[PDB]
Amino acid sequence: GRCGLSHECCFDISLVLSSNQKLVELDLSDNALGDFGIRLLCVGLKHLLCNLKKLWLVSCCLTSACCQDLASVLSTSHSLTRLYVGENALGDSGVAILCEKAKNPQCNLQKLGLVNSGLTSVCCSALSSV
Amino acid sequence: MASTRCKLARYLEDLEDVDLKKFKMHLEDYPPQKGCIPLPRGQTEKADHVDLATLMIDFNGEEKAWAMAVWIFAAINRRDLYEKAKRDEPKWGSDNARVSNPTVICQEDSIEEEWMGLLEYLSRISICKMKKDYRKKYRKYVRSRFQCIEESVSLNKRYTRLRLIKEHRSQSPVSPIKMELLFDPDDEHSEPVHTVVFQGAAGIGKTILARKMMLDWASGTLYQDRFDYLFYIHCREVSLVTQRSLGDLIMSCCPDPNPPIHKIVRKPSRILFLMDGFDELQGAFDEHIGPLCTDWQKAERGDILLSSLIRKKLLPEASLLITTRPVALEKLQHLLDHPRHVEILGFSEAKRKEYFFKYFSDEAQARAAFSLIQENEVLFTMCFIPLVCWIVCTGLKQQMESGKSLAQTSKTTTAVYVFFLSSLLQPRGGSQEHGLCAHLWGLCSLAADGIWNQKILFEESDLRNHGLQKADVSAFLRMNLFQKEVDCEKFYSFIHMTFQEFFAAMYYLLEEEKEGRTNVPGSRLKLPSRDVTVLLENYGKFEKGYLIFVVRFLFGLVNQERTSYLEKKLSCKISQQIRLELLKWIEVKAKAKKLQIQPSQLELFYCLYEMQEEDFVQRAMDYFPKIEINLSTRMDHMVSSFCIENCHRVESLSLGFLHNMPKEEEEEEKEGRHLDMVQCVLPSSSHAACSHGLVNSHLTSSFCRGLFSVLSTSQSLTELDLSDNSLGDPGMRVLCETLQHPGCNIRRLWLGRCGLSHECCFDISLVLSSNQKLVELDLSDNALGDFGIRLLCVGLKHLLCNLKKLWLVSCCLTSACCQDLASVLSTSHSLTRLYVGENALGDSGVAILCEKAKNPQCNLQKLGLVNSGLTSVCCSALSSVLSTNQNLTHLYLRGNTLGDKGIKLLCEGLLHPDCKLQVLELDNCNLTSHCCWDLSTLLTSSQSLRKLSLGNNDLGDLGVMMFCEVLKQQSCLLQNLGLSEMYFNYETKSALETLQEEKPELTVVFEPSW
Amino acid sequence: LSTNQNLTHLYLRGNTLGDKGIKLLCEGLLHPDCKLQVLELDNCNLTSHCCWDLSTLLTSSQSLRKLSLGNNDLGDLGVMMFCEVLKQQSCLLQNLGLSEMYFNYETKSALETLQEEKPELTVVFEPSW
């Protein structure tokens, strides 16, 4: 966390997630990476990687786009227990995808970190059903 | 005699420097004569001649200042100045002074109060009165000719801020410049520029815009008040052979009983002519007619008057605004230079609703009808070019006067027109006695003559010839709502030129009222030929208005099923044989000549789009594998998408900016032509600047999803080109999913010179993994970087042996990527050619690029390393590469400095017999005569090489001489040699031709040779 | 040119004539008794329009050997007719020189193939690869 990493690393970190498997927790908070990074990290999250339960990704200067990416992995993730994606630039538009993924019984997530994300009341109608 | 200061300054110039010093001292020490106050020492010494004269006047007054000078000239003994001062007595009026607030010695002094106004009124008599008389009149007059009928009664309420993307110079800043400073250039650039032109589709509203633009500025309205006059001229009244002067043209706008034109002949470039519709110009017009016009008042020919006006040779400073039809641009564009092209677009989705906000009076009228448009998306995408929206709202409005709307069946532009006619011909048309179908033919006959004889303004003079001048046409007039009042004097006309061209197409199918009617109103002659082949033969002529809609509407009309139960007054086998005739027209165009004025491929695609149902359109679409089109709006994207849905097996698709497609020449094998640099000239750093701040919110995931959905259904398509396209990474993701489809079948894909980056390279790597059947990729000139190379490599090594060539030049690549390119080539099966030149690899980068080439698995053959920045230090490596590689045969190195030290190793690099080099490029390599002997020795001793290039180097007379010894050594079984770009005298050429004459085996070429 | 039995060469590069003048040039060699073998018309301010006219003479003229026409508005359509010149077997010309105008692939496209087809005529394209 809090380092200066970016997307090229996220390619390398995605390869690391694919090869370690025994890795159970990762903190990338406060690292200014963006969305492409989330795309590559997701192809990592979905290969020999059910064991990953927690992921810290706050303040990574992430736009809403990444939400399309976070949905698909969570749409297939086996044992992702906690997610911390707050304080990034997702917005109510971004979470509109983040609520679609949560309808399935396969969603083994337990916690959700959305503090200071900039969301408004319009997004509550969605997560209420979630 | 206005200024005494200037005269005193001239006398100060006359004074010698010693006399001037004495004059200053005397001015500072002036004695008290005639109440004269001496100048302060600092002011006198610092002041120049002009300033000192002003300071002398300011200190005491003009009369005292001159009197002081006369005394000083005598005191300084400047007799000539003293005599001149006595000889010349200037008038005491005053010079220009920045005393805006008057100041006097008395404490009360003076102010900018009423006194100023009184003085101004006393001295100012003509300027203000003349300006006032010229202004108010012109303004109110130009203002009251566009309203107050008892629909054209409110115009500004019908504004919209219509789109105005002004063509950026055709070889990013926004600057919409809609109203304010639209004529004004950028910083300086071109201050005296006068010509601006508007490009818009037929029916956009360019005629409306001029009326609005007049109406805006016809009240000042915070428009270009720094511009004095505007001149509206629509070419409906203007015709050939008129022999009328500009003043006659000017007095046409405002018929002044006492034309002040002598005062209108004032301040050129302060007056603007708003010329309207080049399409409206009817008749022949030579863009470079022989006779020339420069006289403003001479009664000259109508086209000649315009000719001088368009060339601005008459009235050299007059500004001009010309609404023009895009198809007619080439005439004026060749005619006139530096034209401010302005693309104008119709209403958007929301704006179309906002038009109904202007139009409709109730939501149940507005909201319900508009809701129908959204469901009818084919109509909705057709709801561009606001004229069609006018048809939509008006026609539906009338339907509400009788019933409820439906799907409206308006899937095509023609379907919009005919549905409008059906509601139009409701009350009296149904009865046979008052059947207007024969009268519909009557107006169609008039419509046909409207362009066949170029008389839009037929007037009562010709309507009586074509039909019932009083009784019947009055209903049609009231149905057409405007046929006479536009001219306002006596002439009669039509609503718009689309209607005239629409009815012109109808008469062709109606067999001219069948062959069993006739009954002409005196028209035994002047019948345009019922044949349609002549229509395509005169197609594209300005004499006939380029005949777009006439031909275009024919396709929509001949829909058999549609018009069968719509008209039952339709054509016969004549239409069926017309289709074959029209089929032949489309057939010949693609096969015979691609270079014509503008029979565009998309323009034909518009035609086939109107003609629904598969087979005829299929035969026509299968007449061209060369599809090179440009797109501007959803409708253009839709018609292109729909037309390609037909047929299959199509070879090549082309899109994007284009208009020039260099720097992408394929070489294949055993070619005499290779890929060479172009880089254009003008893109420079502007291309990179546009790639970052492009924005373009009007371009989205749409405009592409549908079009590429056709490509996903390619059905045995092979080649796709996307060069120069402004397609960014999101569109690239859509294209990659499209390619992923098993049914894409695409063989080659070109995306060079675009603005792509690494996110795409992730998507392009996925595409390479999924297509496999892709055999060639061009990513040249795309600023991507190295991460992209890393992702592209994991792509190159999965289900991807088939890829043989890859173009990656100018991709702003650093050396790092070389570590990546090595590993893939260390494992690549069938990568035949590689182009990675002009990137920032350096000798450090190629140090890896040589390591990979040692293995026998390296099935590479060509190598593009031109302009890569490499130096001699890297030659020691690649020298060993060539001997140890059994497949490389070509190497290109033009523009890269090596020097003879590096080239020395190159000969050793081919010294080994197991070398398979056939082609080498060494032009502009910074090479000298010294190494020429060394390389020549190899050339005789090497049999594998075929062609070599060595231009732009220090070959020298002695060096080029050895090529004769090469010939004298019969081992010179080379195939080609290319030298160029160096000036020499006769002897270099002298041996050249003789040995070229002697040698037919070797194709020696000297480019600068005669 | 018609009335002279000895003149065989004329050089006119850089001199503006325009297609109106060049139109008469074809007529100027229309007479069978013309003995012109070399003509220079590069940089003559010439357009594609007259290319058809001069081409007609080229097929119908046997005396001419070499011609130069660069730095003029030949156009894609105009340079195309040189293929029809080849397709008209009467094209027993000895050389042809065009240069100094940028075009896209199609101009070069037919060039090499017909140069490959034709060894009789020494067609040369200076800016060609």
Ligand SMILES: CC(C)(O)c1coc(S(=O)(=O)NC(=O)Nc2c3c(cc4c2CCC4)CCC3)c1
């Ligand atoms: C790009 C190219 C060559 O096709 C082109 C550019 O401008 C023209 S044009 O012919 O002069 N103008 C029009 O065609 N306007 C128009 C259009 C449609 C439907 C209708 C109209 C007029 C009323 C119905 C569909 C899109 C264009 C052609």
Ligand SMILES: Nc1ncnc2c1ncn2[C@@H]1O[C@H](COP(=O)(O)OP(=O)(O)O)[C@@H](O)[C@H]1O
């Ligand atoms: N800004 C606009 N607002 C509303 N309607 C418009 C506008 N511009 C054009 N129109 C419609 O277009 C028709 C006239 O178009 P016109 O100016 O003749 O286009 P063009 O000059 O391209 O043929 C009118 O019936 C009008 O309803």
